[PDB]
Design a binder for these strands. Structure first.
Lengths: 140, 471, 600, 493
RNA sequence: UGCGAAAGCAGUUGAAGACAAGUGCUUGUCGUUCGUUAUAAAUGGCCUCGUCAAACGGUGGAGAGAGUCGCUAGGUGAUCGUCAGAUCUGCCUAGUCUCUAUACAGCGUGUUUAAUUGACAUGGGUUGAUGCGUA
């Protein structure tokens, strides 16, 4: 019927010019998705570091939630958005340590990452089988 | 069931019958009724016959009769699977029958693990008796001694089709645990789905946890939430303990793995679904299927026995109380609190009563002579039962032998007061008792491997009136 | 739960009646209306001095005092705030008795003296209750007469319980209705218990019962939430209203040692199923449901402390666990001085959590059955072992194994009888004393494999066993509850590769990652640095142990040059790990014209 | 015998940001019409009565739009200067408007030619003109004179009452429901002032401090009032005279605010609040005034309104922009001889002793793949999976069912390169998704183990494994990467 | 088969008798016994009672579809080629941008927490099966 399916990893209820920090902060506070998307369109890694560097630590936690939602719904954005996530943890790591709760507020990230990592052993098995069969017909 | 019309060689069908048809017969002067015998070959532990009387006019069940359908851990007595074209898990080939008989008799005699214990549940609101049949639950009324319902609780090829030949090697999802909240408005079920053979994903079991509801007037349980892979991937839920009335009005439960992890789930009105409220890390690298779990009535403290260590966990912080650790001689099979003061812990060698207030053992009884390797880990839990007012009960089953062990068994029930100081009663039943549990009244019900549920508890007118009735 | 340091309220006057410390409490009366959880005022009646009202916080202070002649004794006192014919007023009622000749019932009204009235009471006034809603004053007399008065002391109604020599009267409220129960001693240790309802007559008798075996002379009595608690000869008897039926008897052994006559005891309630008990200068917080001592405090600077009253928390309804109690403290010295002191009381959450392991009440394997089925002396042995000479290994092993009929040098399931903890502990002490240096008996090897090895001897065990490699290895593999601290320091101190892996396996199996991480933080930055160096130079359990170290080391501590070498090492492992995974999976896994030669 | 179970569609564990019952309702305001006006649309109001037309004030004119037609049906251009309100009375017969000149004109709604009453409230501009909800005869006017006069329709020469005490422009006026005597005004002082008309008046009973200039004051319930000013909106309780909640999720200064209750939505009550940042957002008072939906517009939104509770027809959401644009979003709501011959069909057995019903309810029509599985057509069921315009989730079920039935090799025997490519094409896309990755591995493993020989001789299949090898290697990098972010995340905690 | 965790760790799968076929010998079988913890394949697949249209309420969604040479990041091809680059105003993937009946999937609206109605004489006969539509 209309039951809610879920999983056991859902801990939800437990320096340079061109920085867009001003636009990012406004988009996060007001939850303006369209304004946020324009900020996320930037792909120059030098900008990404600098914007997050000047971004207030409190707003960073909300940014991690948003990226986790975009990554989870759209798998093709997993690549370009990981650099955003990787810098958020790098720069505001000290702040993220001194916060009362992580699992409840970052439940989306934990669920999203857990889904991908769990597929790894099966993907390697497919890789070995594909590599074996591909080699046989190439050499022949 | 196929009715072959021999005049034109045609055939009419009655499919999705509850079991394979052992016997058919046309019963009546005009063939009004058909009498059928159904087998329910899913349960390999026993031969579950069901007698069906159909009205031939519209092929509707006029009368369906069967007893309780418990699933025992291992095959009992001389149960033989029916003959099929091939030898499978649910059948025997032509040749395999005799060797299977001999092997089963030899297993019953020579081997030492003689576990036939079965899981059963009692509905607090209705006092109906729930039997987790394979992939389905039987609701059976022991007051009226009739079945009230048969419901499928899992996905799988259950009644979509009748499995034949290689399809008969498939395994439907197995309902491992089934429990009720104290209120009785919620049913918690735990299931293991087995992948088919000859695939890459042919060794990764799937563990599913489900929460169902129903109103008291209704008869069918409705799935309200489903959790796929609780606790992680390929990690079983070894124990389920519904929460006491104090905490969340009995709308919560605890689940425990073989890695020592605990998870507390609760029903949230805002969400309208069950949510994982609390978690404990199964992070250390230890595996053990012998885990037990108890909860104090006030709900303040939880007792989690993992392998040979009992841990006292505060519920509020969901961690050890700040002695918390009790070491036991061997693995804990059972932990229960007869009363808030006294905690009774059964290990693989003995049974002890420890007073929490003093933290000292009052009584210790030897179990090793009777329980050495007979039962797998976790079944002494379903052999020991505990009342909330008067006392607990120990059930010991032992083989009779006269000049090598014989198939026939004898069981003994011992009533023990709180702290095991004295034996209120000692009784002997002449046959293996699979399960004993405490009805929410004073009496205790027990199940016997013959599917018998016993209970242990405290003038001219006058001549005319006759004549007119005869006519 | 905790007991706070008493703070002084006022110093009692030096009057002859108050000089008897044993009877001092009876001469001080505490008003029921003014002393509760929320009130910051206490109205106190000190016989022969005055009736005074004190503010508690922020600093104790005297707000009002009514002088009384020194020859008078206060028998009952109560004060309540309300509205009278409308002005907010505070009604004070106090009943005084002069040399047994005349008894005075006095009511005073104050504006928040508006009026003062006085009448002669027929007998001693034992209890006074003020009903501000009806503008009534109700007094219970020692002769059994319950007289209802207005604020002008005009007698409105009088009711007789038909019994004299009343000794106890207590007012309580249930479901908005006023009730009072009284106890009258009878002959032969008998007591007539009467429960009265306050509503043509305003007083209705609900229950009357005669209780046998109820003595007053050596009994301390108090009531709380429908339960009457009587302390006598070290046993607390619990009686339940409305019929006052004996429910439970609780023995309190710490009072059983008290000699009769010298030890001053007071007993008052503080919350549901929790009471305050004082013995001389020691104050006890007790939980009567779980029979546990929640807290104890000794007042070394006073000879005795006598509880007068306590503000009681209905913890079932109140989230507040902090209250106060008032008592009389007497100082040590040739010229003892008595002072009124208040104690702040943390009572707790009323859960089994608070009472765990705090009992005030201070094994041999038994056959399951006394009497054709398929089968699946501790002290003496210690004495024999104790009689042996020092360093006699063969005799010590022979006596232990032979007497106990132990067949193996390691514990088995057939030694369940020997699992008595006391016997094991005594043997361990003998092994240490008898043997020292480089030679230990085989019995120690057996004990180390015993699941119930005492926790007391786990600490420094590895330090004892460091000399002998075999015995050290045995403790790592099987000795139960080896504390993590010694395992970790041995992990970073031992250079033996084999012991490192075995120690790593033991640490991971028996301890959680969150637990282990805290200790690794304590370890020196050099020791972890050396450990990392070995790694660069089952293996997963070592690598998993390394991952824990990096978390313990944290972000700031790690150094770039070392991180580079660690980074290069792990990259090599990942490539090797991927290579082996690929191998592991592999292990799991016509022409139109043809020319041929015929075979003929 | 039991009816055949229906095949259960595959549902993976829930992902973040699932659709909510509140969102599913508000997405239905689909049809968007953008009308362009000559100046900023300052105020928008809905007729309380059927057909619930709404009036927009812009520049020097007031226009009434038909609800069904969504077009202008009446125009009021008699005003010489700017117009600052078009509120209707509770009866809906009259609409009052204010002017920059200070003149208040009351017209008959749906008769722009007739003017019933003209009041010179003050010499300064009159920005607010609202009929009293409880009492029809009395009309309230607030002007830049900072006095909010209470007029009577009968006596238009002098005000009934002149409420004063505001030290700045009063641009907001509210009547508390169930309290006809109480009147609330909000000035740019930041103070919301409550007055009692039953008493002498002209002095507020009390003032509530908003700390920013108040742009609109609305009474959601008899005891609560919500006031929007500055960058947030706060809800006050009159009984307690203290703010219960505050929501400041907006970026620009909130301008207009409207409240609708007891309409057919899942939410019993809704609060819409324009932002001046292009946003109009919905809050639910039953859940602590938490945001539940939003719209974005081209420019700052000066006015918003939603169709009343009893709209009785298609609902409307109207937004007013300073550019002069008006945005409308709408949620749309034989012979007599033959009959006498066949006449009993209408009867439902109301007068009969026994009523017997055996008709089985009509089940939903099954799809082709389900019919094939039911009829044991394993190979044809696989073919139906990979057809154009087939739902991705619906394709995953048939693959899972065949695996569950144990028919994975059986479905793959009678196949060649021509009929294997559709499965491999989907596998090329299904490998990317986390839900269908594991199932793709099982099916691709069998086809390789079952068609190794055909692979060598068939070129087109070969490229399907080269590119499939490329993608699975890509997924490996993503799954390895997700483990690394997992590892560092454990370090932080 | 035993133990255990699910991973796995150890260990088995023997002899006699009778029958059939082929040529005393060979092979295969067992509604035969003793002992040990111990491929399949006889063309052979699951009934009927009522369908269709339009709504409504929760549950999910990779959204179902169409554009925008508007931006961002990649990959890559034909021909020529002074290797710098040219014409195809090249192509494809992903994100973003604009829009629509949320347009997509599923369960229910016999009472449920919530949520429905309407159409049809549920027949017989004739023609078309080279049916009808489309390239």
């Amino acid at each position: 019927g209309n039951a809610r399916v879920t999983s056991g990893d859902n801990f939800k209820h437990v320096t340079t010019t061109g920085t867009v920090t001003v636009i990012l902060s406004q988009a996060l506070q007001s939850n303006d998705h369209s304004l946020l998307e324009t900020v996320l369109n930037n792909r120059d890694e030098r900008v990404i570091r600098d914007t997050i560097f000047r971004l207030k630590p409190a707003l960073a936690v909300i940014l991690l939630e948003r990226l986790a939602e975009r990554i989870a719904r759209q798998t093709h954005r997993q690549g370009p958005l990981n650099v955003w996530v990787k810098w958020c943890l790098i720069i505001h790591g000290g702040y993220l340590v001194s916060i009362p709760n992580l699992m409840s507020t970052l439940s989306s990230l934990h669920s999203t990452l857990k889904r991908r990592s769990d597929l790894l052993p099966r993907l390697l098995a497919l890789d070995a089988r594909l590599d074996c069969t591909i080699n046989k017909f190439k050499t022949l | 069931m196929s009715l072959w019309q021999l005049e034109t060689n045609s055939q009419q069908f009655l499919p999705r019958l509850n079991g394979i048809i052992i016997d058919c017969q046309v019963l009546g002067p005009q063939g009004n009724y058909y009498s059928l015998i159904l087998q329910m070959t899913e349960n390999n532990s026993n031969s579950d016959y069901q007698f069906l009387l159909l009205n031939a006019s519209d092929l509707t069940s006029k009368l369906s009769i069967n007893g309780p359908l418990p699933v025992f851990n291992s095959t009992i007595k001389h149960i033989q699977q029916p003959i099929s074209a091939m030898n499978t898990k649910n059948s025997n080939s032509i040749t395999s029958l005799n060797h299977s008989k001999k092997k089963q008799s030899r297993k019953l005699i020579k081997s030492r693990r003689q576990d036939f214990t079965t899981n059963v549940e009692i509905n607090p609101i209705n006092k109906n008796l729930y039997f987790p049949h394979i992939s389905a639950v039987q609701i059976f009324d022991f007051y009226k001694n009739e079945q009230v319902n048969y419901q499928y609780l899992t996905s799988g090829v259950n009644n979509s089709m009748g499995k034949v030949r290689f399809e008969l090697n498939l395994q439907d999802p197995i309902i491992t645990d089934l429990k009720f909240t104290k209120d009785g408005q919620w049913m918690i079920t735990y299931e293991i789905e087995y992948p088919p053979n000859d695939l890459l994903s042919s060794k990764d079991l799937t563990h599913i946890l489900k929460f169902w509801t129903k109103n008291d007037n209704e008869t069918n349980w409705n799935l309200k939430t489903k959790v796929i892979n609780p606790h992680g991937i390929s990690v079983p839920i070894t124990k389920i303990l519904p929460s006491p009335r104090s905490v969340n009005n009995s709308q919560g439960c605890l689940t425990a793995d073989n890695n020592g992890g605990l998870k507390f789930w609760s029903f949230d009105s805002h969400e309208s679904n069950w949510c994982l409220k609390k978690i404990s890390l199964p992070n250390f690298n230890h595996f053990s299927n012998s885990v037990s779990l108890a909860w104090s009535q006030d709900g303040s403290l939880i007792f989690h026995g993992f392998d040979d260590k009992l841990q006292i966990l505060d519920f509020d912080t969901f961690k050890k109380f700040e002695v918390s650790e009790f070491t036991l001689d061997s693995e804990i099979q059972t932990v229960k609190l007869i009363n808030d003061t006294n905690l009774i812990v059964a290990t693989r060698t003995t049974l002890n009563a420890i007073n929490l207030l003093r933290g000292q053992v009052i009584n210790s009884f030897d179990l090793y002579p009777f329980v050495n390797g007979v039962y797998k880990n976790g079944h002494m839990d379903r052999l020991i039962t505990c009342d909330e007012r008067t006392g607990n009960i120990a059930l010991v089953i032992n083989q009779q032998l006269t000049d090598v062990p014989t198939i026939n068994y004898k069981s003994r029930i011992i009533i023990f007061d709180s702290d095991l100081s004295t034996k209120l009663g000692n009784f002997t039943h002449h046959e293996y008792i699979s399960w004993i549990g405490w009805n929410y009244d004073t009496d205790f019900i027990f199940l016997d491997i013959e599917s018998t549920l016993g209970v242990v508890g405290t003038s001219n007118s006058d001549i005319f009136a006759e004549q007119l009735h005869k006519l | 739960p905790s007991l706070s340091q008493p703070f002084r309220l006022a110093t009692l006057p030096k009057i002859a009646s108050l000089s008897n410390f044993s009877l001092q409490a009876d001469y001080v009366q505490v008003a029921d209306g003014t002393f509760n959880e929320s009130t910051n005022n206490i109205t106190l009646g000190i016989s022969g001095s005055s009736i005074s009202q004190y503010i508690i916080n922020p600093t104790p202070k005297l707000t009002f005092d009514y002088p009384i002649p020194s020859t008078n004794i206060i028998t009952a006192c109560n004060a309540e705030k309300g509205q009278a014919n409308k002005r907010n007023v505070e009604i004070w009622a106090f009943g005084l008795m002069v040399n047994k000749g005349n008894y005075t019932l006095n009511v005073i009204t104050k504006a928040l003296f508006l009026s003062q009235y006085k009448i002669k009471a027929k007998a001693k006034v034992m209890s006074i209750k003020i009903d501000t809603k009806n503008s009534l004053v109700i007094a219970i007399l020692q002769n059994g007469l319950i007289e209802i008065f207005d604020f002008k002391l005009t007698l409105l109604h009088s009711f007789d319980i038909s019994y004299d020599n009343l000794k106890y009267a207590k007012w309580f409220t249930e479901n908005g209705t006023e009730y009072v129960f009284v106890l009258c001693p009878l002959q032969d240790d008998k007591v007539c218990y009467k429960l009265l309802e306050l509503t043509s007559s305003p007083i209705k008798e609900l229950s009357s019962t005669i209780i046998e075996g109820f003595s007053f002379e050596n009994s301390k009595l108090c009531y709380q939430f429908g339960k009457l608690y009587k302390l006598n000869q070290g046993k607390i008897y619990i009686y339940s209203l409305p019929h006052c039926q004996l429910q439970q008897v609780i023995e309190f052994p710490m009072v059983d040692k008290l000699s009769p006559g010298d030890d001053l005891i007071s007993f008052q309630p503080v919350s549901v199923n929790r009471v305050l008990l004082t013995v001389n200068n020691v104050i006890y917080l007790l939980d009567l449901l779980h029979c546990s001592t929640l807290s104890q405090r000794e007042l070394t600077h006073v000879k005795t402390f006598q509880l007068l009253k306590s503000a009681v928390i209905n913890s079932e309804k109140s989230h507040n666990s902090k209250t106060i109690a008032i008592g009389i403290s007497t100082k040590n010295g040739p010229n003892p001085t008595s002072s009124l002191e208040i104690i702040n009381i943390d009572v707790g959450t009323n859960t089994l959590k608070d009472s765990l392991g705090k009992s005030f009440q201070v094994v041999i394997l038994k056959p399951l059955f006394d009497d054709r089925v398929k089968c699946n002396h501790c002290n003496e042995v210690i004495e024999k072992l104790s009689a042996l000479q020092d360093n006699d290994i063969t005799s010590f092993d022979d006596i232990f194994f032979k007497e106990l009929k132990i067949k193996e040098e390691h514990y088995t399931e057939k030694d369940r009888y020997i699992s008595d903890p006391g016997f094991l502990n005594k043997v361990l002490d003998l092994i240490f004393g008898k043997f020292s240096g480089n030679d230990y008996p085989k019995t120690l090897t057996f004990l180390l494999t015993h699941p119930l090895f005492p926790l007391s001897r786990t600490r420094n065990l590895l330090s004892l066993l460091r000399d002998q490699p075999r015995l050290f290895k045995q403790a790592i593999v099987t000795c139960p509850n080896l504390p993590l601290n010694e395992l970790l320091e041995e992990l970073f101190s031992i250079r033996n590769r084999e012991l490192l892996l075995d120690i790593s396996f033991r640490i991971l199996q028996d301890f959680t990652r969150d637990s282990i991480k805290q200790e690794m933080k304590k370890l020196s930055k050099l020791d972890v640095q050396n450990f990392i160096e070995f790694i660069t130079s089952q293996s997963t359990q070592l690598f998993q142990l390394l991952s824990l170290v990096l978390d313990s080391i944290g972000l700031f501590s790690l150094e770039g040059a070392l991180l580079e070498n660690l980074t290069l090492y792990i990259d090599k492992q990942v490539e090797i790990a991927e290579r082996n995974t690929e191998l592991w999976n592999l292990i799991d896994t016509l022409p139109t014209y043809t020319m041929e030669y015929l075979d003929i | 015998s039991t009816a055949r179970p229906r095949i259960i569609t595959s549902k993976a564990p829930l992902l973040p940001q699932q659709t909510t019952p509140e969102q599913r309702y508000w997405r239905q305001y689909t049809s968007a019409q953008l009308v362009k006006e000559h100046n900023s649309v300052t105020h928008i109001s809905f007729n309380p009565q059927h057909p619930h037309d709404f009036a927009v004030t812009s520049s020097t004119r007031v226009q009434i739009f038909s609800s069904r037609t969504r077009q202008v049906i009446k125009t009021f251009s008699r005003f010489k200067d700017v117009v600052y309100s078009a509120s209707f009375r509770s009866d809906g017969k009259l609409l009052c408007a204010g002017d920059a000149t200070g003149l208040v004109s009351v017209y008959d709604s749906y008769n722009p030619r007739t003017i019933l009453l003209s009041i010179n409230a003050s010499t300064h501009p009159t920005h607010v003109t609202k009929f009293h909800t409880q009492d029809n005869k009395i009309l309230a006017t607030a002007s830049d004179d900072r006095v909010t006069r209470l007029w009577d329709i009968s006596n238009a020469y002098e005000p009934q009452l002149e409420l004063t005490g505001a030290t700045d422009y009063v641009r907001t006026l509210s009547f508390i429901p169930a309290a006809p005597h109480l009147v609330a005004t909000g000035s740019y002082d930041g103070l919301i002032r409550l007055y009692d008309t039953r008493s002498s008046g002209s002095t507020p009973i009390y003032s509530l401090n908003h700390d920013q200039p108040v742009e609109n004051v609305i009474a959601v319930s008899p005891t609560q009032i919500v006031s929007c000013g500055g960058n947030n909106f706060k809800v006050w309780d009159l009984t307690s005279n203290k703010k219960l909640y505050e929501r400041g999720n907006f970026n620009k200064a909130v301008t207009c605010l409207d409240y609708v209750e007891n309409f057919d939505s899942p939410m019993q009550s809704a609060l819409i609040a324009s932002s001046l940042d292009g946003h109009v957002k919905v809050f639910d008072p039953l859940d602590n005034f938490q945001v539940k939906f939003g719209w974005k517009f081209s420019g700052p939104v000066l006015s918003c309104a939603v169709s009343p509770s009893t709209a009785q027809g298609n609902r409307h959401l109207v937004a007013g922009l300073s550019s002069g644009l008006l945005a409308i979003r709408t949620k749309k709501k034989k012979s007599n001889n033959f009959q006498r011959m066949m006449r009993g069909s209408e009867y439902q057995g109301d007068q009969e002793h026994i009523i017997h019903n055996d008709k089985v309810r009509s089940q939903r029509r099954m799809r082709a793949f389900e019919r094939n599985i039911n009829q044991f057509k394993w190979s044809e069921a696989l073919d139906n999976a990979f057809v154009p315009g087939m739902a991705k989730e619906l394709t995953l079920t048939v693959l899972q069912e065949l695996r569950k039935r144990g028919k994975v090799r059986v479905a793959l025997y009678g196949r060649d390169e021509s009929t294997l490519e559709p499965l491999l094409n989907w596998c090329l896309k299904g490998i990317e998704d986390v839900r269908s990755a594991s199932i793709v591995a099982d099916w691709v493993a069998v086809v390789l183990e079952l068609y190794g020989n055909t692979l060598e001789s068939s070129p087109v299949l070969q490229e399907l494994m080269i590119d499939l090898k490329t993608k699975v290697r890509h997924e490996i990098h993503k799954s390895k990467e997700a483990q690394r972010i997992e590892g560092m995340l454990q370090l932080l905690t």
